[PDB]
């Protein structure tokens, strides 16, 4: 969301995020089904499936996303350009 | 099966390649 | 017992016509806009011709005319394009009027 | 109780039949052939994702497999009939300027809606801000010409995909059926083909509405007695 | 946005005020015209503002209030006009009618600004 | 809430997941019909790409055995006087009639192709068909 006022930017981004929703399949409602390796615009993401109790040792941003999604355990390593959007 | 299916052939309506006025002449 | 699509296509008049170049066909006029005869034949697209200067008054809607088709569709690929630009129309020469 | 019984005997009943509205009799392979459905554009104008539907090329002109066209048309008509049965809003969208008058007349006769004019931005993704907060979006969109006047895919199909509106679209040999729910590979330029499509869809909608009234009237009569 | 019910209330208020105004001026309420209303308003409320629209005005609610179209969707939400999803149904229907009449004519075949 | 990501799965897949997650309180009107009669191909956005290298389109030309006869009759004896009437589904041109006679004589079992062509011309002359050669 973009706006001259920061509060307006918060409102616009939030109201557009609720319309644009993905669906994430959680294995046993705590992890991902299989390890995922991907590259997106010079950003390498490598996620490892973990057993229960492992925790979210992924990233400060990925922890926030995983908590919102509902994932409890994962290990993600980010390499290359650390860009929040990518 | 069916005999009306198209077969594999070279183009029979293809015209011969055009030749210059001096083709074949020393 | 039911006719197959391959059989229909094989025996269709358009297939047995062969190449469309310099072939005499019969078209029917269905639209006239300012001396522009939008003649229609048994093809995907129509052909637009000009009303003949000699006794052109008889060229009205529903009139059947004789045409010499040159191309069923005018498509051409130009510089920098990834596809052929098309005019969605055919090319033909208005020979005259079909008479029975 | 009564509402659940009403829904089960009226809405769920046709879903248990392969062809509840009997749309097979409407069209046949020979009828499509006489309507010049199989004709297509040049091989140079051929677009990807249409190759499976294209039967072949005949003198630099694509030919569409009418066997696949009949199956796709059967599914499209069945979906159209069920949506009309369910009191759904059907919108006919076509940017072609040769059949705009015919398509608008078809919408009037069948009782549904049409859009054959310039498609202003935001008619679907921003409909509430233009028509009104309580506007009801169409439940089905039928494309008779998926390409705009610059030989590119229409923006309505992308907007319908965004808004989760199923689309029944006629696709020629130079269209993109990737985002069309029910693509019908045929000819979108021959007047005979366009008239045939309008009549088939008009008949399917009219039969669905009439059968809905007959079933509802019969159910009310059975409930009374 | 003014609703039809609000317009009806304004019409009723206009009629009541018109009869009251005729009573104040001591004339026949039945044979009272808009010109008579304008004269009474001008005398009772003399305004010298050069712009006429800034002066007190008592006219019929139909003329005073703007014009708004009816809601195209009912309780079920179904639009009433086939060319509704074009956003300009009135214009496009008019263009449709003109084009149809032009086709019909083809089948058959100073002070005006 | 809904989902406006048209490039991520189909409309049905997105709707089904949202209903499963409880985001969509009520399923749409088309959901039941789609589930009952799904299309042959699920509509998923796929980007077209150019065919580089030696890749060729699988679309093949349409040819028949009679195409040799039609090409030969369009070269020698030229196009017929009768104008093609493509409106009539049962139209039979002079070239097609020549092809049919050539096929019939082939069914009889003549060996020489040149003699087969000449005999076909003789049959049309006997029938009265006008044969005006271009040369
Ligand atoms: S075409 Fe030029 S030498 Fe033959
Ligand atoms: Mg087309």
Asked whether E56 and E41 are in contact (CB, 8 A), the reply is: yes
What is the CA(B25)–ligand 1 centre distance, in A?
9
Q: Which two tokens stand for residue C74?
A: 């005018």
Asked whether A31 and A73 are in contact (CB, 8 A), the reply is: yes
Asked whether A2 and A12 are in contact (CB, 8 A), the reply is: yes
Which protein residue has the closest C-alpha to ligand 1 atom 3? B23
Distance, in Å, from the CA atom of F61 to the CA atom of D182, rounded to the nearest integer, reads: 27
Q: What is the 3-state secondary structure (H, E, C) of E41-87?
A: HHHHCCCCCCCHHHCCCCCCHHHHCCCCCCCCECCCCCECCCCCCCC
Which technique was the structure solved with, according to the deposited record?
cryo-EM
- The total number of structural domains in chain D stands at 1
Asked whether C49 and C89 are in contact (CB, 8 A), the reply is: no
Please work out, in degrees rounded to the nearest 5, the angle formed at the alpha carbon of residue F42 by the alpha carbons of F41 and F44. 120
> What contacts D92, CB < 8 A, 6 or more positions away?
D103, D106, D107, D112, D113, D114, D115, D116, D141, D142, D144, D201
| Owner of token pair 């209303």 | E37
> What contacts F77, CB < 8 A, 6 or more positions away?
F98, F121, F131, F132, F133, F134
Q: Buried b / exposed e across C51-87, counting CB within 10 Å, b at 16+?
A: bbeeeeeebeeebbbbbbbebbbbbeeeeeeebbebe
The domain of D194 spans: 3-222
State which H helix or E strand residue D140 sits in: strand D140-145
F58:D178 CB<8 A? no
User: Helix D100-110 vs helix D191-224: angle between axes, to the nearest 10 degrees?
Assistant: 10
Q: Is the CB of B20 under 6 A from ligand 1?
A: yes
Q: Which two tokens stand for residue D47?
A: 């677009």
Please give the full DSSP string across F26-72, using - where no structure is assigned: S--THHHHHHHS--SS-----------TT---S--B-B-THHHHHHH
D166 backbone dihedrals φ, ψ, rounded to 5°: -65, 145
Give just the sign of the alpha carbon dihedral A51, A57, A60, A61: negative
Distance, in Å, from the CA atom of F112 to the CA atom of F123, rounded to the nearest integer, reads: 16
Q: What is the 3-state secondary structure (H, E, C) of D142-199?
A: EEEECECCCCCECHHHHHHHHCCCCEEEEECCCCCHHHCCEEEECCCCCHHHHHHHHH
Please give the full DSSP string across C69-95, using - where no structure is assigned: EEESS-EE--TT-SS-EE-S-BEEEEE
Q: Which two tokens stand for residue D217?
A: 């009237």
> What contacts A63, CB < 8 A, 6 or more positions away?
A56
What is the CA(D189)–ligand 2 centre distance, in A?
5
Please work out, in degrees rounded to the nearest 5, the angle formed at the alpha carbon of residue C23 by the alpha carbons of F134 and D62. 130
Q: Which two tokens stand for residue B5?
A: 């299916």
Closest CA to D12 of D88, D86, D87: D86
Distance, in Å, from the CA atom of A24 to the CA atom of F20, rounded to the nearest integer, reads: 12
Measured in angstroms, the resolution is 3.0
List chain F residues with CB under 8 Å of B5. none
Distance, in Å, from the CA atom of E108 to the CA atom of F12, rounded to the nearest integer, reads: 51
Closest CA to D28 of D63, D74, D65: D74
- How long is chain E? 113
- How long is chain B? 26
Checking C28-34 for CB contacts under 8 A at 24+ apart, the result is C28/C62, C28/C63, C28/C64, C28/C65, C28/F87, C29/C59, C29/C60, C29/C61, C29/C62, C29/C63, C29/C64, C29/C65, C30/C61, C30/C62, C31/C61, C32/C59, C32/C60, C32/C61
Asked whether C20 and C70 are in contact (CB, 8 A), the reply is: yes
- Residue C40: Cβ within 10 Å count: 18
- Residue A77: Cβ within 10 Å count: 14
Under DSSP, the state recorded for B15 is: P
Q: What is the dihedral of CA D118, D122, D126, D131, to 10 degrees?
A: -30
Distance, in Å, from the CA atom of A59 to the CA atom of E55, rounded to the nearest integer, reads: 70
List chain F residues with CB under 8 Å of B11. 61, 63
């Amino acid at each position: 969301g973009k706006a001259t006022d920061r509060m307006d930017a918060f409102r616009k981004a939030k109201n557009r995020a609720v319309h644009h929703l993905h669906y994430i399949e959680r294995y046993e409602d705590h992890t991902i089904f299989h390890d995922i390796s991907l590259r997106f615009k010079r950003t390498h993401i490598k996620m490892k499936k973990q057993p229960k109790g492992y925790g979210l040792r992924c990233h400060r941003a990925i922890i926030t996303i995983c908590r919102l999604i509902g994932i409890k355990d994962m290990y993600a390593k980010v390499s290359g350009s650390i860009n929040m959007l990518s | 099966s069916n005999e009306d299916l198209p077969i594999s052939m070279e183009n029979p309506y293809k015209e011969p390649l055009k030749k210059c006025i001096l083709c074949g002449k020393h | 017992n039911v006719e197959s699509f391959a059989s229909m296509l094989r025996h269709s008049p358009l297939t047995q016509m062969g190449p469309a170049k310099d072939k005499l066909v019969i078209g029917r006029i269905f639209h006239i806009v300012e001396n522009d005869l939008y003649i229609d034949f048994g093809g995907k697209f129509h052909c637009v011709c000009r009303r003949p200067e000699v006794d052109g008054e008889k060229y009205q809607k529903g009139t059947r005319v004789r045409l010499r088709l040159l191309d069923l569709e005018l498509t051409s690929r130009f510089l920098g394009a990834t596809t052929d630009t098309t005019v969605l129309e055919a090319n033909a020469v208005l020979l005259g009027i079909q008479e029975s | 109780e009564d509402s659940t019984d009403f829904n089960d005997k009226i809405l769920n009943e046709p879903l248990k039949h392969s062809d509840f509205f009997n749309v097979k009799e409407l069209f046949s392979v020979r009828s499509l052939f006489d309507a010049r459905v199989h004709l297509g554009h040049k091989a140079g104008c051929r677009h990807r994702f249409m190759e499976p539907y294209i039967f072949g090329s005949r003198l630099d002109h694509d030919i569409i497999d009418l066997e696949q066209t009949a199956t796709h048309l059967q599914l499209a008509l069945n979906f159209t009939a069920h949506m009309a049965y369910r009191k759904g809003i059907i919108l006919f969208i076509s940017r072609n300027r040769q059949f705009s008058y015919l398509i608008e007349n078809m919408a009037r006769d069948c009782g549904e809606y049409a859009h054959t004019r310039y498609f202003r931005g935001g008619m679907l993704t921003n409909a509430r801000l233009l028509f009104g907060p309580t506007v009801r979006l169409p439940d089905l969109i039928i494309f008779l010409h998926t390409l705009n006047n610059i030989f590119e895919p229409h923006v309505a199909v992308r907007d319908a995909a965004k808004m989760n509106i199923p689309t029944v679209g006629i696709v020629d040999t130079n269209c993109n059926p990737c985002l069309i729910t029910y693509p019908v590979p045929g000819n979108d330029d021959s007047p005979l083909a366009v008239h045939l499509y309008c009549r088939l869809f008009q008949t399917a909608i009219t039969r669905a509405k009439e059968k809905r009234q007959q079933v509802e009237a019969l159910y009310r009569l059975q409930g009374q007695k | 946005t003014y609703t039809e019910d609000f317009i009806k209330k304004q019409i009723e208020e206009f009629n009541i005020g018109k009869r009251h105004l005729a009573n104040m001026m001591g004339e026949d309420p039945e044979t009272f015209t808009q010109e008579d209303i304008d004269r009474a308003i001008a005398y009772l409320f003399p305004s010298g503002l050069f712009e006429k629209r800034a002066r007190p005005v008592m006219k019929h609610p139909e003329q005073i209030f703007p014009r708004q179209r009816a809601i195209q969707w009912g309780e079920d939400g179904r639009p009433f006009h086939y060319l509704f999803y074009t956003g300009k149904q009135s214009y496009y229907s008019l263009m449709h009618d003109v084009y149809g009449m032009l086709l019909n004519l083809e089948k058959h075949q100073i002070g005006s600004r | 809430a809904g989902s406006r990501l048209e490039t991520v799965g189909s409309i049905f897949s997105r709707t089904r997941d949202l209903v499963r997650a409880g985001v969509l309180k009520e399923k749409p009107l088309w959901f039941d019909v789609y589930d009952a009669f799904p299309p042959l191909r699920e509509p998923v956005f796929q980007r077209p790409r150019v065919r580089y290298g030696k890749a060729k389109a699988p679309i093949q030309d349409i040819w028949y055995h009679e195409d040799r006869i039609r090409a030969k009759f369009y070269s020698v004896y030229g196009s017929g006087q009768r104008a093609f009437d493509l409106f009539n589904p049962n139209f039979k041109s002079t070239c097609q009639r020549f092809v049919e006679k050539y096929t019939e004589l082939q069914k009889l079992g003549e060996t020489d192709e040149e003699k087969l062509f000449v005999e076909t011309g003789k049959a049309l002359l006997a029938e009265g068909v006008i044969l005006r050669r271009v040369g």
